[PDB]
């Protein structure tokens, strides 16, 4: 699905997530694709939060 497919690729392209986080979000996407927006939202927030480790 155009919106859900897009979420998969956007999660894969988030630069600060590690592979375990990326794989967890993708698993959530597969379990319920209708949650794509929510999953994408969480991934975006975690991507933002991951940047703090570079300053830590």
């Amino acid at each position: 699905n155009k919106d859900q497919q897009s979420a998969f690729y956007e999660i894969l392209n988030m630069p600060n997530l590690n592979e375990a986080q990326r794989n967890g979000f993708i698993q959530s996407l597969k379990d319920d694709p209708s949650q794509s927006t929510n999953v994408l939202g969480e991934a975006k927030k975690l991507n933002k939060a991951q940047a703090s480790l570079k300053s830590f």
Binding site: A20, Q21, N23, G24, F25, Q27, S28, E42, K45, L46, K48, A49, Q50, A51, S52, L53, S55, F56
Partner: protein, 109 residues
């Protein structure tokens, strides 16, 4: 450390322990808090983000909250594997950058 964290604490297994942090309007007052866990000898990793969201793979024995210029991380059913250093992290609008707490060590008796 720009953020002030609650003192290190020792607790027995199965107890509930709350780590707190306080800041100012320019950081915690207007930005969400993340919680970093550093187990002994390991790289620090994100445990919680956006105040109350769990990173994938993190136990929901951890819960987070933010109110005003303070925030907290609660560990329910404390387990020996939770023994670690915990650091709050948040954006600061005045510094235009990340600020951190000094860390709180949780020792499991």
């Amino acid at each position: 450390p720009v953020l002030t964290q609650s003192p290190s604490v020792s607790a027995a297994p199965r107890q509930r322990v709350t780590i707190s942090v306080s800041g100012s309007n320019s950081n915690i007052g207007s930005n969400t808090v993340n919680w970093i866990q550093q187990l002994p000898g390991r790289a620090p990793e994100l445990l919680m983000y956006d105040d109350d969201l769990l990173a994938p793979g993190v136990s929901d024995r951890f819960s987070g909250s933010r109110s005003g210029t303070s925030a907290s991380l609660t560990i329910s059913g404390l387990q020996s594997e939770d023994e670690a250093d915990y650091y709050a992290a948040t954006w600061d609008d005045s510094l235009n950058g990340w600020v951190f707490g000094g860390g709180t060590k949780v020792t499991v008796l």
